[PDB]
Amino acid sequence: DKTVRWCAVSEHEATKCQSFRDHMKSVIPSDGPSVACVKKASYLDCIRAIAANEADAVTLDAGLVYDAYLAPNNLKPVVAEFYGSKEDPQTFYYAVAVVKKDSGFQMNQLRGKKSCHTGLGRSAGWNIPIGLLYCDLPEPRKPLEKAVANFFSGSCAPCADGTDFPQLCQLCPGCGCSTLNQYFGYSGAFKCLKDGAGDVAFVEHSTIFENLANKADRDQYELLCLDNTRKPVDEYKDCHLAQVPSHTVVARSMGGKEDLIWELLNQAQEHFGKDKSKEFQLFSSPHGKDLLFKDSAHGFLKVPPRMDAKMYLGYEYVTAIRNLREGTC
Ligand SMILES: [Fe+3]
Ligand SMILES: [K+]
């Protein structure tokens, strides 16, 4: 069998997955790669399913790539997203802090504000913004969750526990770990800001561009820079929190079907990648944004053989994570 079982988180990803299954099925040889769809409530359930041989592949934020390499799962990174263009591909992106024009505050004046995150554990939504703001947080700083809940005056951290940390779900009651939470992910953290529930969205550089097509509406938003100034959203290259490694597909170490994962995704990149097909798209969707793969991706690059999360992610970002887990001020 040449079937990749894809893990899709909730109703909408599940739909795009069935399209993906059907179009590949229709425009593929008798012998080529098939994909099957397994619906899960969260990225955590996908990670558990892949370790337990009940699924083969899920695409995860760089932060969640790290998380998934830890025991007893030991998921290995297999295919990387790239952004920008197919000519000069990039395997990183920019963590930006998006705010509404004329809101007043800057970064060392973020205390007491409302925060929209993509989700707990994610690079630009959590790890980067919270690590930089770590010593600004009140004591005690463990647990970290409870202490960012204390810093802001209400938050939305998708995937967090709302019993243990009610405040982290104030802007999105429940802290849903899927698109079913309307304020989950990139597009969801920007909807959280736009609706006026929050003051800052910790998102990627291309987030606003994919959620607001009109430049006149776009100019009512700006970014928070590290020198405590503000700059137009277009000038993200000189006003960003950090550069983070790209979302990756992960797979099992043993019997991971990584070769096939590549074969499927690479063929799928030629048939349905950016601007390639009017029947199906891999990096946009009728059913939502950033489903299965991010909207801002332009295709895929193969991860070198048998490389682990640790190595793929790089020392600067692995180190950035570990420092967050145990620090001092
Ligand atoms: Fe991300
Ligand atoms: K508070």
From Swiss-Prot:
Expressed by the liver and secreted in plasma. Fe(3+) 1 binds at residues 61, 93, 186, 247. Disulfide bonds join 7-46, 17-37, 116-192, 135-329, 156-172, 159-177, 169-175, 225-239. The modification Dimethylated arginine is found at residue 21. Hydrogencarbonate 1 binds at residues 118, 122, 124-125. It is found in: Secreted. Residues 4-326 form the Transferrin-like domain. Monomer. Part of a complex composed of SLC40A1/ferroportin, TF/transferrin and HEPH/hephaestin that transfers iron from cells to transferrin. (Microbial infection) Binds to Neisseria transferrin-binding protein A (tbpA or tbp1). Forms a large complex with TbpA and TbpB. Belongs to the transferrin family. It is linked to Atransferrinemia: A rare autosomal recessive disorder characterized by abnormal synthesis of transferrin leading to iron overload and microcytic hypochromic anemia. Has a bilobed structure, each lobe binds a single Fe(3+) ion. Does not always bind 2 Fe(3+) ions. Transferrins are iron binding transport proteins which can bind two Fe(3+) ions in association with the binding of an anion, usually bicarbonate. It is responsible for the transport of iron from sites of absorption and heme degradation to those of storage and utilization. Serum transferrin may also have a further role in stimulating cell proliferation. (Microbial infection) Serves as an iron source for Neisseria species, which capture the protein and extract its iron for their own use. This is Serotransferrin. The chain holds residues 22 to 350 of 698 of the full protein.
